[PDB]
Design a protein around this ligand. Structure first.
Ligand SMILES: *[C@@H]1O[C@H](CO)[C@@H](O[C@@H]2O[C@H](CO)[C@@H](O[C@@H]3O[C@H](CO[C@H]4O[C@H](CO[C@H]5O[C@H](CO)[C@@H](O)[C@H](O)[C@@H]5O)[C@@H](O)[C@H](O[C@H]5O[C@H](CO)[C@@H](O)[C@H](O)[C@@H]5O)[C@@H]4O)[C@@H](O)[C@H](O[C@H]4O[C@H](CO)[C@@H](O)[C@H](O)[C@@H]4O[C@H]4O[C@H](CO)[C@@H](O)[C@H](O)[C@@H]4O[C@H]4O[C@H](CO)[C@@H](O)[C@H](O)[C@@H]4O)[C@@H]3O)[C@H](O)[C@H]2NC(C)=O)[C@H](O)[C@H]1NC(C)=O
Ligand SMILES: *[C@@H]1O[C@H](CO)[C@@H](O[C@@H]2O[C@H](CO)[C@@H](O[C@@H]3O[C@H](CO[C@H]4O[C@H](CO[C@H]5O[C@H](CO)[C@@H](O)[C@H](O)[C@@H]5O)[C@@H](O)[C@H](O[C@H]5O[C@H](CO)[C@@H](O)[C@H](O)[C@@H]5O)[C@@H]4O)[C@@H](O)[C@H](O[C@H]4O[C@H](CO)[C@@H](O)[C@H](O)[C@@H]4O[C@H]4O[C@H](CO)[C@@H](O)[C@H](O)[C@@H]4O[C@H]4O[C@H](CO)[C@@H](O)[C@H](O)[C@@H]4O)[C@@H]3O)[C@H](O)[C@H]2NC(C)=O)[C@H](O)[C@H]1NC(C)=O
Ligand SMILES: *[C@@H]1O[C@H](CO)[C@@H](O[C@@H]2O[C@H](CO)[C@@H](O[C@@H]3O[C@H](CO[C@H]4O[C@H](CO[C@H]5O[C@H](CO)[C@@H](O)[C@H](O)[C@@H]5O)[C@@H](O)[C@H](O[C@H]5O[C@H](CO)[C@@H](O)[C@H](O)[C@@H]5O)[C@@H]4O)[C@@H](O)[C@H](O[C@H]4O[C@H](CO)[C@@H](O)[C@H](O)[C@@H]4O[C@H]4O[C@H](CO)[C@@H](O)[C@H](O)[C@@H]4O[C@H]4O[C@H](CO)[C@@H](O)[C@H](O)[C@@H]4O)[C@@H]3O)[C@H](O)[C@H]2NC(C)=O)[C@H](O)[C@H]1NC(C)=O
Ligand SMILES: *[C@@H]1O[C@H](CO)[C@@H](O[C@@H]2O[C@H](CO)[C@@H](O)[C@H](O)[C@H]2NC(C)=O)[C@H](O)[C@H]1NC(C)=O
Ligand SMILES: *[C@@H]1O[C@H](CO)[C@@H](O[C@@H]2O[C@H](CO)[C@@H](O)[C@H](O)[C@H]2NC(C)=O)[C@H](O)[C@H]1NC(C)=O
Ligand SMILES: [Cu+2]
Ligand SMILES: [Cu+2]
Ligand SMILES: [Cu+2]
Ligand SMILES: [Cu+2]
Ligand SMILES: [Cu+2]
Lengths: 636, 636, 235
């Protein structure tokens, strides 16, 4: 019965903005009544709250932007999640989903239903469609969407007048985004536009926040996920990759964010479904004038000073006034939880969310204090207030760099690793060599037909993306005696924006983990010959909505999880003629430990680059090797 | 043959963005060739230039915003106007118009064809459609246009799901703009949004600049128009009306524009045809930082200092170095021409256009120095760079207030009027009384069907506008002996934003001329009983494109000229309970003096309020009377 | 050596009068700035920064020492020019002089020492234009058209003026790198100032009529193909 259930849940994601077209779903929406069917829900309080909200009309109006950073939106989405998750039977769950689809905003319903499907036992096999297919308007420029609407409604008669559009195959018409948006931010935004505007990266951020919502309290499974450590590690990896891209395109180090003025602005060029332009941050934005920006920055400074005091003093304050030490090396998780100010933080009243205030300030979304129903505020969020568009703005990377400065301060106070924790007896690496590192640009097609308001075709968008050829890394190692070992590869830049070789201690923060795997080392001489195509950290493209629908309706793979980095974004572009980089191979013992499942050997994720490392403490540690490589770009 | 010619010229304005659909026009476009038909054009140089431009493709690309402030755009539009105007026969003119419609940008073609029709003898009867019907996208928000597209393409099946839209009559569907755009500039922009965003006002500005393009040199007819005096008078009238509106809504005096920072920003909420959002000026914009704004402001300061020096020294410098005096009272025209820096200015090389630089600076249109054909720059103009959207921004009023400060400086140097120039023998005004002054808001419908890309309905937009009830002004006057006299009425505010009564000398700059007419005064007692419905200065609404098309195809009025203020914008709103104003009745002798035709008694348009006036010099002048009135607003 | 050949304090003779001093000045400055921009693009530094009248972001530390052993003046980063300092007065004088030059360029004539107007609208007036901009001893009127480039150099050298004099006479000065021709080119501020002067020159050239197809064409001479063997550079 998997196929039919998946088909129905897909039909729930066919046209969010438009109303229900399938008749029996209308019958269910008109027939079901929560009041009399309270007995089928475990959480009766959620049922009462939902009934009250739906009766008083105290809900976010339909056809309006939705943001989780607003309090009332969080309350509404949490209540709906509690109601949906408390469904005893799958039938009750589906019937509540239909009713909410009828009586709930599109974005909120999609998000809550996806979260419920991911975290429900009865729906551990259902596959949810990609976000960039349900709402294409968050990943393509407004001109593209308007042209799509025109070419569709024209009946493809004036389409042949358009030279940009073309018919690649029957029933599909494709455009070019190569020639468009001549007006753009420029500054530091254009050279890295092939990485920051990538659809897959924003989709990955959205899916990550689907797996770990800020408004959802962890269960036994989510309590072993080490939420804070994942936050820190993922932010570090993203910032290291972004810095590598900037060095590749010659833009320099990530600008440091102050408290007086921000020089770089952002113009999104995106449009909401209704047609409201996004807020724009001007260049040379002033933060020390008579504006709400000043008050927001003062609150941000207070909260960050509280975090700094907690880090330095070595303990945090409970909600009653007790001191809880965080000086042990295993307190990184609670530190991250406190910094994030999620619902799992011990004390959110004193440790508040300054990152959201940073996002509000640097989004320059004019607060007009407008409310509907004498209730829910009406907000026009900027790109930074949406996880599916935040990564397009450099300000996000600047803010995360500040948070990573806080994290580095905390890690600095920790004792440095010893020659016993960081050494494996009688394992010496001889030589490490990669076959080649080449990158090239290629074309890809995305389906944006779900935005078209069909009455009674399939428009696609062509985009340019980076990719790399398969590469093999071969290392020879002395093994001493037989062992079961783990090998980790790290990649870092070798020269900074000016030309001086970066010391290893500084590079410790710029090392990007690209592969980790097990091996059984024999006695004597060995050979590791890892191929990039075998790594499980990076995955291939997930099947599109159309492909999944075809494979389902016509009637598995475990190499496509929503919480993995796309393969084509693993390797930096480099330069034509070669760009130098540093590879680091580290071998350690194997210390023995589907929607949201990731686990490796029990140890800090960034080991051994989480703490600062110095050359003088690597003498006597032979199982770590630092080689130099060159990354090339194939021009086309 | 008027009807058929008008029908064809209307068909030339049916779908600018879309290509030619009528077959014989395609045949003409494919058959006509300028090279062999040079003999039918008087200006052969224009023919050669047009041929060269069309062969080299050195022209503005189609489907791109067009602005006259750019040099190459001016050159192209001037060349096309020269080509069209040099058509010996009407047939040649129409055949060139079709060819250009086929091979020219939409906005440029519409503008040039309208100008040619207005200034051509063979087309002095043709009536051109309103601008707000040809390009509705410049007068309504992007959300409205997107909703229109959706309701049209949906086949009016999901339209009935929309509660906003409704069917007022057969074949027409109407919306509401009352509930939309909750995100808005606020500050000083919302309380006067009913006046600054009025469609008729922007259309009036566009038609005025159609009558007097900056790139067209005047002929005998246009040389008697006193271009500079018209510029000054119209700007003064607009600023006085805007100040009256601000006082009515309690916003205060027009802010003074400096050279360091502009506090008030603007968000248009408009979208171009393709779907590119308009530039946004942030609040508290800084002009004294390391930006191109500083250089632009320095050039502006240099040019304005040149103007100030020319005004103070009493003479202007010719292109050879000669001094030409401007100290006479009849030099206002050349002064205005110099300030405007039009093609009729004596010396544009030394006296340059600083107002355009002000518009560029305060539009905050990011210059990205992008060019097509290795030629024509690509520009995304702001609202201030288009005459059909400039009036929506307060910065325009601030800039015009600065220019009016320059004009007031010039007028101050002139000698004050005497008791002989300002007096009429034996004519004493006894009493002046108006019956009532009431204002109310009403609904109106605009047709935006021409934007819809119909394949193989008629959507309308409902807007709220101000209007007034008919009022009668009755004055009793002693006449002495029989005479033929002219009576002028002026309206001004009585109290400023704080509460002090404004002295007459300051109010001289705030007097708005509302009526001027002739009369024959008898001997003894007389009675003037003017009714607002008789004034010819203000006109009624012009027939829409649909109405004109119906009246033409089915098969005159002279009270509808494109260069007259709409009647409903004549009177300030006032306040509920009454707002005090000052009326001034002035009687003078009758000194004896269709597309663009306006002439009155030979005298300065702003007489006697062009020069400063003082109470002590009005003793002995009995033919001028100052009464007080109250304007009321009917709330609904 | 160039300033040895054409000193600002030496009046030209028959030989130096055929040298077209102003045109040489303009051409050499343009060539230097084009080469510098090519170098910047080669090393990925971007376009030459535009010099304003409020603040200069880039500073300079020479690292040089005079014969006696006095360190050179240092310009700090983010130097402020709109505060209560002599920099403001110097910048005001610079602005006045540059506005005088702009007015002379736009009006089409220059003012003599007596008050006469001399036209500069012909294409062969580039030499006198350069002489006026340089304010050398060969300029027609140095009293009205003064040397603003020297004031720019003084301002951007940040040489602290201490008003010290010897013999009750000759001032004692510690010049910066910009005040010496043998060290001026080490500072980007020089290139910025010359870019401003070249903006003035480009304004003047823009007012000139564009070349025609008769001045710019040679009858019956068509170029087929151009090819270079190789372009390689090494340290
Ligand atoms: C079915 O559906 C419903 C609806 O969908 C779901 O209901 C939600 O359920 C969750 C979980 O139960 C609730 O969250 C918790 O709520 C309680 C109660 O908060 C309410 O009352 C507060 C006022 O009383 C509190 O303060 C007064 C003094 O002023 C005090 O006398 C009283 O005893 C009590 O402490 C309100 O303040 C509060 O909301 C107000 O304040 C908020 C904060 O400023 C503000 O945001 C609100 O807008 C409003 O202004 C609310 O009305 C909370 O006590 C509890 O708080 C814990 O977690 C937060 C972080 O999320 C943390 O900051 C707190 O310090 C506290 O942390 C303790 O518990 C954590 C786990 O919950 C634990 O991880 C911490 O370590 C800590 O516990 C450990 O340490 C502490 C000492 O630090 C120790 O005492 C403990 O024993 C332990 O050792 C949560 O916020 C939602 O409120 C509720 N929502 C609704 C709408 O119903 C329901 O979950 C669904 N059920 C099922 C089965 O699915
Ligand atoms: C058929 O089609 C064609 C194409 O559609 C139409 O052609 C257009 O026709 C108009 C009108 O004829 C032209 O405008 C006039 O152009 C002339 C010539 O300008 C050209 O040449 C300039 C260079 O030569 C000038 O300077 C040199 C020195 O450097 C000097 O030696 C030479 O004698 C001459 O003076 C170029 O500079 C100029 O363009 C360049 O410069 C522009 C300005 O910076 C710049 O914008 C350009 O981009 C380019 O860089 C061009 O190539 C102009 O002389 C004439 O200028 C008058 O008007 C302007 C204001 O518009 C004003 O500033 C000038 O000072 C001058 O004013 C005198 O004439 C006015 C009337 O024209 C008059 O109102 C003024 O009072 C003044 O006249 C009185 O006072 C003066 C003293 O101040 C005195 O001398 C007079 O005798 C009199 O007493 C116009 O700009 C278009 O150029 C032309 N365009 C094209 C593409 O062909 C044609 O009209 C159509 N024909 C028909 C029948 O329909
Ligand atoms: C042997 O050794 C000695 C020492 O080594 C050498 O002596 C040097 O020789 C040179 C060349 O002769 C001198 O330069 C010229 O000096 C004269 C005189 O200037 C002195 O007097 C001025 C005051 O009198 C002036 O103003 C009053 C009104 O106030 C007026 O009534 C009077 O008639 C006269 O006009 C002083 O102001 C001046 O110094 C003061 O002012 C300076 C400027 O502010 C200031 O710097 C000083 O610090 C001081 O404050 C001085 O004491 C100048 O008249 C002459 O000026 C010309 O050149 C300059 C640019 O260098 C230009 O600005 C002037 O406008 C003027 O330009 C005319 O002549 C140019 C050629 O000389 C020519 O190119 C111009 O086109 C122009 O000529 C043409 O147009 C004009 C109209 O514009 C027209 O009248 C002409 O007929 C013609 O058509 C020079 O500065 C040195 O002063 C002198 N130095 C010393 C220490 O002796 C000597 O050269 C050696 N001899 C040999 C054979 O080798
Ligand atoms: C893009 O996605 C749409 C679904 O949003 C696809 O629509 C399908 O088109 C095929 C055409 O043969 C139909 O048989 C299916 O029934 C359609 N499905 C739905 C849900 O409408 C469309 O084919 C996709 N196009 C591409 C190129 O992937
Ligand atoms: C709005 O304007 C359009 C033209 O842009 C009008 O279209 C006309 O509609 C009538 C309907 O009976 C047709 O007979 C005409 O042939 C149409 N003209 C064109 C040029 O298409 C439309 O009627 C107008 N609607 C309103 C309410 O004024
Ligand atoms: Cu969408
Ligand atoms: Cu700044
Ligand atoms: Cu339009
Ligand atoms: Cu401010
Ligand atoms: Cu600074």
């Amino acid at each position: 019965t998997v196929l039919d259930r998946q088909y129905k849940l897909l039909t729930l994601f066919f046209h969010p903005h438009e109303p229900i077209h399938i008749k029996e779903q209308q019958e269910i929406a008109a027939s079901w009544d929560l009041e009399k069917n309270i007995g089928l829900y475990e959480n009766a309080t959620a049922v009462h709250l939902t009934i009250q909200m739906l009766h008083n009309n105290y809900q976010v109006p339909r056809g309006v932007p939705f943001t989780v950073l607003e309090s009332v939106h969080r309350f509404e989405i949490s209540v709906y999640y509690s109601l949906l998750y408390s469904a005893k039977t799958y039938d009750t769950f589906y019937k509540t989903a239909v009713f909410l689809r009828q009586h709930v905003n599109e974005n909120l319903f999609v998000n809550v239903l996806s979260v419920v499907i991911l975290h429900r036992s009865d729906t551990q096999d259902i596959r949810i469609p990609p976000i960039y297919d349900v709402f294409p308007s968050y990943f393509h420029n407004g001109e593209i969407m308007t042209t799509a609407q025109r070419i569709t409604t024209h009946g493809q008669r004036m389409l042949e007048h358009y030279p940009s559009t073309y018919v690649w195959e029957n029933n599909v018409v494709i455009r070019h985004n190569e020639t468009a948006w001549p007006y753009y931010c420029n500054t530091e935004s254009m050279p890295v536009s092939y990485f920051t505007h990538d659809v897959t990266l924003n989709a990955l951020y959205y899916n990550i926040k689907l797996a770990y919502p800020i408004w959802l309290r962890s269960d036994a499974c989510a309590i072993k996920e080490k939420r804070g450590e994942l936050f820190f590690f993922w932010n570090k990896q993203l910032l290291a990759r972004y810095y590598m891209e900037r060095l590749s395109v010659g833009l320099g180090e990530i600008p440091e964010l102050g408290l007086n003025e921000v020089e770089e602005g952002y113009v999104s060029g995106l449009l909401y479904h209704n047609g409201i332009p996004y807020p724009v941050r001007p260049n040379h934005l002033v933060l020390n004038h008579q504006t709400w920006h000043a008050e927001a920055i003062e609150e941000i400074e207070v909260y960050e000073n509280r975090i700094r005091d907690m880090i330095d003093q070595g303990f945090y304050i409970t909600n009653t006034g007790e001191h809880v030490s965080i000086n042990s090396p295993d307190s990184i998780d609670v530190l991250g939880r406190l910094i994030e100010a999620n619902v799992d933080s011990p004390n959110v009243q004193y440790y508040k969310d300054f990152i959201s205030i940073w996002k509000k300030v640097l989004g320059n979304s004019l607060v007009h204090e407008s409310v509907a129903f004498n209730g829910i505020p009406l907000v026009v969020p900027s790109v930074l207030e949406q996880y599916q568009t935040a990564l397009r703005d450099p300000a996000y990377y600047m803010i995360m760099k500040r948070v990573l400065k806080l994290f580095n301060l905390w890690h600095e106070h920790l004792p440095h690793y010893t020659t016993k924790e960081l050494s494996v007896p009688s394992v010496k690496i001889e030589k490490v060599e990669v076959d080649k590192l080449l990158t090239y640009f290629e074309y890809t097609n995305f389906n944006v037909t779900n935005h078209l308001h069909l009455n009674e075709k399939s428009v696609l968008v062509q985009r340019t993306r980076l990719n790399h050829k398969v590469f093999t890394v071969r290392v020879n190692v002395k093994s001493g005696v037989a062992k079961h070992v783990t090998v980790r590869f790290f990649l870092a830049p070798k020269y900074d924006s000016v030309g001086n070789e970066i010391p290893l201690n500084v590079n410790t923060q710029n090392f990007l983990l690209i592969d980790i795997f097990n091996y059984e080392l024999k006695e004597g001489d060995n050979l590791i010959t890892r191929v990039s195509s075998d790594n499980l950290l990076v995955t291939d493209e997930i099947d599109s909505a159309s492909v999944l629908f075809n494979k389902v309706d016509s009637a598995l793979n475990m190499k496509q999880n929503i919480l993995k980095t796309p393969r084509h974004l693993l390797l930096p572009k480099g330069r034509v003629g070669g760009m130098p980089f540093v590879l680091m191979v580290y071998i350690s013992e194997y210390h023995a430990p589907i929607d949201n499942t990731i686990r490796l050997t029990s140890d800090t994720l960034g080991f051994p680059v989480d703490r600062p490392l110095f050359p003088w403490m690597l003498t006597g540690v032979e199982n770590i090797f630092l080689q130099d490589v060159q990354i090339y770009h194939k021009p086309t």
